[PDB]
Amino acid sequence: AAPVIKAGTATDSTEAGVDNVANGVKSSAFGYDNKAIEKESSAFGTGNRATGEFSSAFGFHNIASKIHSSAFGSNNAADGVNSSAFGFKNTVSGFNSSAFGSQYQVTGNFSGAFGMGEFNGQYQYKNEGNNSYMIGNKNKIASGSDDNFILGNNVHIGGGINNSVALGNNSTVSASNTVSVGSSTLKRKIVNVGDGAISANSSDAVTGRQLYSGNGIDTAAWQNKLNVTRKNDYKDANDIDVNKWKAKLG
Amino acid sequence: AAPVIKAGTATDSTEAGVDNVANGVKSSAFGYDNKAIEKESSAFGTGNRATGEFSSAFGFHNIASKIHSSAFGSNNAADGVNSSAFGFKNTVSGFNSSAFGSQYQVTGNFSGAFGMGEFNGQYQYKNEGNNSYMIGNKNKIASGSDDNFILGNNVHIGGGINNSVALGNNSTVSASNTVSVGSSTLKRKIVNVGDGAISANSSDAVTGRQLYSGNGIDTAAWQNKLNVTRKNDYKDANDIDVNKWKAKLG
Amino acid sequence: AAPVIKAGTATDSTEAGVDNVANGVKSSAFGYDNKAIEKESSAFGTGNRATGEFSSAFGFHNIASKIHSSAFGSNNAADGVNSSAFGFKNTVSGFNSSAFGSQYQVTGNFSGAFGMGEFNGQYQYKNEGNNSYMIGNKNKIASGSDDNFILGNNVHIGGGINNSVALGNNSTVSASNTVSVGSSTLKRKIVNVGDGAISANSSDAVTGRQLYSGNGIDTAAWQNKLNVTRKNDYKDANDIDVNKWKAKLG
C-alpha cells in the first residue's frame, strides 16, 4: 500500500509512485500509472507511456513509441524516430519532425508546426507535407505538397503545390514556386521596399517612385513598343513622306 | 528526516523528496518544495507549483494554474487553458496560447511568441494581440491589434493595426492589411523575384527587367495618358490642322 | 541494492533511483545515473547531468551547465546562460538563445533555431549569428552575419551579410539589407499584392495592373526621358523649324 519505491521487471528498472510499471532495462517509471516498457525509457508524470527505446514521456498522458521520442506536455503522442511533440495534444507521426503548440498533428517527414489547430475527435488541421513548416492557427497542408512554408492563419494548401510560401492572415496559395501575400478577396501592400536595380537581367521588386519617374528605362525598346516621335527628327523633318505630304499641305 | 516517500492528503497522491506537498487526487509531487494541489496534477523539480487540474509543472520554479497548463523550464508561469510556457521565465496568460524562449509574455488569445524579450521587474515586451505570432527579439504588439505576424527584432505595433506582417530587423508597421519589409530609415530590397503576369486584372510583383523592357504594356492606354505621336499618322499626315499649318509653312 | 531513496552529499539533496548522485544544495537527482552537482539543480531521467546552478535536465542524456539552462528531450546540451535546448540532440552555446528541433546547434547570442539539421559526428548546420533566427531544414549562418532571419530549407548565409531575410525553399542571399525570395536558378513570384501608391516619395511594391495601365505616372518627367510629341503642339505647329522645313516641303 501507499507510494513505494521498488525494482521493476528488468535490471536497473525503477518504479516510483503508485501503480507504476517498468519493464525495460535501465528504465524508470515515476508517478501514477506510468509505464516504461523499452530499454532506457523514462516516463515521468501521470498516466504516461514510454513504449520506445531511449524515449522520454514527461507530463500528463504522454505517449512515446520510437527510437528517440520526446512527449512533453499534455496528451501529446510522439510517434516517430527522432521526433518531438511538445505542448497540449500534439501528435507527430513523421521522421525527424517536431511540433509545438496545441491540437496540431504533423504527419510529414522532416516537417514542423508551431501554432494552434483543432481536435474535436480527430485532427482537422494536419501537416502532410515533407520539409514543410507552419506557424499560425488552423492551417492545413495536403499530402504530396512539399517544401511549403506558412506564416499565417486559415491557410490551406491543395495537392501538388511545391515551393510555395504564404504570408499573412487568411492567405491563399494556388500555384507552385510562388509567394502568396493574400487571397483574391484581401490583398496586402508591400511597404518600405528598397530602391530597385533596373536593368536587362536584374530581377528585383520596383518601387512606386521608380515607376513614377521611370529612371533607367530602355529609351530605345520603349520607343518601339509605343510608337513615339522623338523631338529631334520632328525638328529636323526626318522620315517624312514627300509625295503626298505636299498634297494636304499644298 | 531525509528524503522519504509517502502518501499525500488525497487518494493516490505521491510525495517524493524533501518538504513536498500533494493535495490533489491522483497527483504527484517530486523534488524539493513541490506542490500538487489539483486532481491529476504533476509537479516535478525544485520549488514547482501545480495549482490546476491535469497540469504539469516541470523544471525550476514553474507554475501551472489551469485545466491544461505546461510549464517546462525555469521561472515559467503558464496561466491559461490549454496553454504552454516553455523556456526561461515565459508567462502565458491567454487561451490556447504557447510561448517558447526567454523573458517573453503572451497575454493574447490563440497567440504565440518565439524569441527573447526583457524582464527587469516586469515584462516590457508582451503580446497582447489575438491570433498573433512573433519570432524575434524585443518585439511588442499592442492590445486590440490582431492577426499580426512578426519576423524580426525591435518591431513594435501600435493600436488598431490588423492583418499586418513585418519582416526583417528593425521593421516598422503603420497600417492595416500591409506587409512591412523595413522602416522609414532602412529599406530592404526584394531580390530574385519571378517574372510578372502583366495584364488588366493580374496582381503580381513586377521585376526590374519588365519595367526596363515594358513587355505586355497597354499600347493604347499608355498612348493616351502620355500624349504620344505614333509613327504611322506622322508618315501619313493624319489628324492635321490645315487652316493655320499653311500659314507657318507657307 | 534495488532502487532506494536517500539523501545526497548536501543539505536537502534527494537521490531517487539507482546509481544517482546529488551534490548541490537543494538539488534532486531522479532516475538512473542522474547527476545534480550545483545548487537547486534538478536532473530527471536517464543518464542526465545538471552541472549548473538552477539548471534543469529532463529526458535522456541531457546536459545543463549554466545559471539557467533547460535541456529537455534526448541528447540535448544547453550550455548558455538563460538558454533552452529542446528536442533531440540540440546544442545551445549562446547567451539567451533557444533551440527547438533535431540535430541543430546555435552558437549565436540571443539567437534561435526551429527545424532539423544534421549531426554525423559533428554539427554541420549551425547558427553563429547574433540576433538571428532560423526556421527550416539544413540551414547555415556564418559567424559575423547578424540580424538575419531564415524561413526556408537549404539556405546558407556567407560572412558579412546583415539585415537579410530569406524566404522559401533553396533560397540564397548574397547582400545586406535585402530580402531574398529565391536563388539564381529558381525565382518565385509574389502573388496577390495590394494596389500601389505611385508618387514621388512613396516606396511600395507595384502590381502588374498598374504597370499595364500606368495610372499616376509623371506625365512631365516621362515625356522628357522618352522624347515624345504631345498631340497639342502637333495640332498647333509649335516648336517647328521654318528655315529648312520649307525646303523639303517646298
Residue numbers in the entry:
A (entry chain A), B (entry chain C), C (entry chain B): 25 to 274
The authors write:
The fusobacterial trimeric autotransporter adhesin (TAA) CbpF binds to CEACAM1 on immune cells, resulting in downregulation of their activity against tumors colonized by F. nucleatum. In contrast to Fap2, CbpF is a homotrimeric type Vc autotransporter protein, in which all three protomers together form a trimeric passenger domain that remains exposed on the cell surface after expression, and a C-terminal β-barrel domain that serves as a membrane anchor. The ECD of CEACAM1 comprises an N-terminal, membrane-distal immunoglobulin variable region-like (IgV-like) domain and three membrane-proximal immunoglobulin constant region-like (IgC2-like) domains IgC2-like A1, IgC2-like B, and IgC2-like A2. CbpF binds to CEACAM1 via a protruding loop (D142–Y149) and via H92 on the respective adjacent protomer chain.
We next vitrified nanodisc-embedded CbpF for cryo-EM and SPA, and obtained a density map with a final resolution of 3.8 Å. The rest of the ECD after G274, and the C-terminal transmembrane barrel (predicted residues V378–L431) were not part of the highly resolved structure. Within the N-terminal part of the ECD, V28–N216 form a β roll domain of ~64 Å length and ~44 Å diameter at its widest part, comprising 14 parallel β-strands per protomer. The last β-strand (R212–N216) is swapped from the neighboring protomer into the stack of β-strands. To deduce the potential receptor binding site of CEACAM1 to CbpF, we inspected the surface hydrophobicity and charge distribution of the CbpF/ECD. The CEACAM1 binding loop shows an almost identical arrangement in CbpF alone and in the complex, with differences limited to side chain orientations.
